[PDB]
Design a protein around this ligand. Structure first.
Ligand SMILES: Nc1nc2c(ncn2[C@@H]2O[C@H](COP(=O)(O)OP(=O)(O)NP(=O)(O)O)[C@@H](O)[C@H]2O)c(=O)[nH]1
Ligand SMILES: NC[C@H]1O[C@H](O[C@H]2[C@H](O[C@@H]3O[C@H](CO)[C@@H](O)[C@H]3O)[C@@H](O)[C@H](N)C[C@@H]2N)[C@H](N)[C@@H](O)[C@@H]1O
Ligand SMILES: [Cl-]
Ligand SMILES: [Mg+2]
Ligand SMILES: [Mg+2]
Length: 293
C-alpha cells in the first residue's frame, strides 16, 4: 500500500508532464487530503484529489520577494477539478524543531530569530496589488462557519459544547484584533515549514498553501504557541520585538482567540468534508479544555 500508491502517482506524473521520467519516488509527507512525494531525490510533487491559489502565490513571490531565503519555485503544474499536482525542486535543509533549537547557542538562536523577523518584514511589506484576489477575512469566515453549525449539528450538541461555542462568539464580537493592518501572510508559519542550513540559519520556507492578504498578526500565531510541536512563547515574543511596530499584546490576543477556536474549526472541517471523526474529536477537545484546572 506504500508501493501501490506510489505507482499510480508515478504514472500520473509521467502522463501529465510528457518528458518527465520518474527514476525514484517516495512519500515524504501527507495531510488528510493531500500527499507529497520526493521524486528523483530532487523534486517535490504535492498532489491532491479534490492548488491554483498556491501556484499564483509562488509565482507572485518568486517575482517580487527580495530575499536569500528559498521558497518553492513551481516548474510543473496540472490543475483540474478532480486532480492537482505541483512540482518544484526540493529545498535542501533540516526542519526546525524544538529539540534542535534547544541545542543552539544563545547567539545562534538570536540569528535565527532575526532571520525570521527579517523574512516576515519583507513579505508583509510587499505591495500585494498583483495578488489582490487572495484576501482572507478570518472574522467573517468564522461567522459563516458558525452559521453552517447552526444549520446542521448545533441543536444536537450538549449544553457544555454550546456554551463553549457561544462563549467564543461573545469574545469574537468584543475583540479588536481583526481591525488592524492587513498584508500578505504565509498563514501557516510553524516550525515544520522552516528549513535550516548547516549553520542553523534560515535557508528555506515551504507551504504557502494558505497564504493570503490577512491580518499581520496571523504570521505570529505558531511562533507564539506553547506546545510540543512549537518552540515557545519567548521565541515568538523576541521575534515580535525584532520585527517591530506591532502591538505584542494584540498578537497574543489574536493567537489566543485562534487557539480557542481550534476545536470548533475541527468540528466545522468534519461537517464540510462529511468526516464524523473530526466532529467527534473537536467536541471531545471542548470537554478537555473545559475541565483543565
Ligand atoms: N526538505 C523539504 N521538504 C519539503 C519540501 N517541500 C515539501 N516538503 C515536505 O513535504 C511535507 C508536506 O509538504 P507541504 O507543502 O507542507 O504540504 P502539506 O502541508 O502536507 N499539504 P497542504 O499544504 O496541501 O495541506 C512537508 O512537511 C515536508 O516534509 C521542500 O522543499 N523541502
Ligand atoms: N497538533 C496539535 C496542535 O494543532 C494545532 O497546531 C498546528 C496547526 O494546526 C493543524 O490543523 C490540523 C487540522 O486541520 C491539525 O492536524 C494541526 O496540525 C498547523 O496549521 C500548523 N502548521 C502546526 C501547528 N502546531 C493547534 N493550533 C495547536 O494548539 C495544537 O497543539
Ligand atoms: Cl460526534
Ligand atoms: Mg505543511
Ligand atoms: Mg499547507
Amino acid at each position: 500500500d506504500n508501493a501501490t500508491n506510489v505507482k499510480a502517482m508515478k504514472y500520473l506524473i509521467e502522463h501529465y508532464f510528457d518528458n518527465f521520467k520518474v527514476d525514484s519516488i517516495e512519500i515524504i509527507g501527507s495531510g488528510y487530503d493531500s500527499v507529497a512525494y520526493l521524486v528523483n531525490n530532487e523534486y517535490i510533487f504535492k498532489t491532491k484529489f479534490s492548488y491554483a491559489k498556491e501556484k499564483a502565490i509562488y509565482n507572485f513571490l518568486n517575482t517580487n520577494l527580495e530575499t536569500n531565503v528559498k521558497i518553492p519555485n513551481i516548474e510543473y503544474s496540472y490543475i483540474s477539478d478532480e486532480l492537482s499536482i505541483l512540482g518544484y525542486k526540493e529545498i535542501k535543509g533540516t526542519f526546525l524543531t524544538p529539540e534542535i533549537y534547544s541545542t543552539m547557542s544563545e547567539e545562534e538562536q538570536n540569528l535565527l530569530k532575526r532571520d525570521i523577523a527579517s523574512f516576515l518584514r519583507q513579505m508583509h511589506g510587499l505591495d500585494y496589488t498583483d495578488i489582490s484576489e487572495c484576501t482572507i477575512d478570518n472574522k467573517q469566515n468564522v461567522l459563516e462557519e458558525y452559521i453552517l453549525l447552526r444549520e446542521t449539528i448545533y441543536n444536537d450538541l450538549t449544553d457544555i459544547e454550546k456554551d463553549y461555542i457561544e462563549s467564543f462568539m461573545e469574545r469574537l464580537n468584543a475583540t479588536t484584533v481583526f481591525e488592524g493592518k492587513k498584508c500578505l501572510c504565509h498563514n501557516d508559519f510553524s516550525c515544520n515549514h522552516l528549513l535550516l542550513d548547516g549553520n542553523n540559519r534560515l535557508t528555506g520556507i515551504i507551504d504557502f498553501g494558505d497564504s493570503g492578504i490577512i491580518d499581520e498578526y496571523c504570521d505570529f500565531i505558531y511562533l507564539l504557541e506553547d506546545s510540543e510541536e512549537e518552540i515557545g512563547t519567548n521565541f515568538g515574543e523576541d521575534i515580535l520585538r525584532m520585527y517591530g511596530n506591532i502591538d505584542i499584546e494584540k498578537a497574543k490576543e489574536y493567537q489566543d482567540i485562534v487557539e480557542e477556536y481550534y476545536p470548533i474549526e475541527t468540528i466545522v472541517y468534519g461537517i464540510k468534508n462529511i468526516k464524523q471523526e473530526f466532529i467527534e474529536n473537536g467536541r471531545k477537545e471542548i470537554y478537555k479544555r473545559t475541565y483543565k484546572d
